[model samples]
Target: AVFERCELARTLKRLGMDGYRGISLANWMCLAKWESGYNTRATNYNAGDRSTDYGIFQINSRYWCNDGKTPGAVNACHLSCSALLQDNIADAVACAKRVVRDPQGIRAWVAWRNRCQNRDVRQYVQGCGV
Candidate 1:
């Protein structure tokens, strides 16, 4: 499920992503764009910690979800890693919200820091009508 920019913007808005935890929807859009390109099935394996990032939000297995293979993992999201890969995105959105609840807020994702922080992200949602 590779979502178009506006489609993803509207979807995220519907899921309560706009101003979630004080992070704007455009910032979230920027994160998803750099992290997974809005592809629901996207995945990236981290050999350093033997953890994997799953789904559009790229939620990680080590701290957020249980994959049964990441050593000393804590499933703070209380869901299976596979749940993040679904096209529905509800689970992924929930987990994303949970992640921001941490002290880091939206900075939980390094992609957001490197690519979105201090950047002009309005283009991500400019024509979305979100």
Candidate 2:
């Protein structure tokens, strides 16, 4: 599912992403925009590490979810990587929360640092009544 920006913003807010672990909704929006473009089916395989990033928040099989192919990977989220690709996004959201609880916080995503950090991220949630 490819969500419209405002729809995604409102959904994330409803799901309690507004300030989960001190990260704002707009920042989450910015992360998703850069990571997956609001598309739930998005994925990126990392050949260098034999891992794969899955779904909207791009949770990784290397440390978060288990795809059973990543070398020495840990399933910190305790769910299959396939769950992240669902349109419902509930599992994906839960996994993303677990990711931020780590020391890296939202910086777990390089996309956030490169595109969302220190930028006027509120624009991501603007004009949609989020």
Candidate 3:
């Protein structure tokens, strides 16, 4: 499922995601844009780690979720990777909050580190009114 930018913003806000775990709504919105562009079925495989990133937040199978066939998978989130790639984003948001609470904060997302960290992201939600 692909959501319009403002639709995503409003949804995120309704999910109790605004200013979640100290990260502002702007940063979270920006991260989602870069990660999956609000596409629920997004998936990316990393050959080097033999792992895959899933869902809007791109939760990794190596540590967050299990892809079943992947050996040595940690399954930290204790859910299937497929579960993340659904139209409903509740589980994805819950796992993302856990990721942010870690020492890395939101730096778990390289996109956020390179493109949004320490930068003004007010523009990401310019007219969302979230």
Candidate 4:
């Protein structure tokens, strides 16, 4: 069912880390839950302030659109700014690896995950495989 996105997420998952391994490719489950609530075409409208957004990551199109990305570009559900959400699970996973290179501890995504594992939400983002 998730063949394409998962494959792409795997490619992206290995981004910054060398010989690094974590959870499922991009943790599709958690990422899906937190992002678009599992709806590929989901969109968020915080009209008052957050503004219009779309896709699994609920990426606000305003900025991501400038980067030549649009929803459905991959996992963006074919909208704007969706790529900013990393498109598919593979992208999300690769993005996670890139975080391993950061050295700022809490500022570094890896460090933050290391510290926040006890918190279910973070744990969900980690082992559960978003």
**Candidate 1 stretches greater than 4 Å from native:** none
* Candidate 2 lDDT, 35-71, residue by residue in tens: 9999999999999989999999988898999999999
Q: Worst ten-residue run, lDDT, model 1?
A: 43-52
Question: Where in model 3 is the C-alpha error above 4 Å?
Answer: none
My TM-score estimates for the predictions, one after another, are 0.98, 0.97, 0.94, 0.37
lDDT of 1 by residue, 1-130 (tens): 9999999999999999999989999999999999999999999999888999999989999899999999999999999999999989999999999999999999999999999999999999998998
- By TM-score: ranked, best first: 1, 2, 3, 4
lDDT of 4 by residue, 7-110 (tens): 33433344532235443433433444555554445766665554555454444444333224333323222333444343354443333344343453123323
Per-residue CA lDDT of candidate 3, range 1-130, in tens? 9888888888888998888878888898889889988788999988887889999988899888888866688877778888898899988888888788789988999999988998889998889887
Against the reference, the lDDT scores of all candidates come to 0.95, 0.93, 0.87, 0.40
* Model 3 RMSD, rounded to 1 decimal: 1.0
**lDDT score of residue 34 within candidate 3:** 90
Model 4 misplacement above 4 A: 1-28, 66-118, 121-130
Task: Give residue 16's error in model 2 in angstroms.
Answer: 0.7
True lDDT of residue 1, candidate 4: 17
Winning model by lDDT: 1
Clashing pairs in 2: none
Could you tell me the lDDT of residue 48 within candidate 1?
Answer: 84
Candidate 4 lDDT score relative to the true structure: 0.40
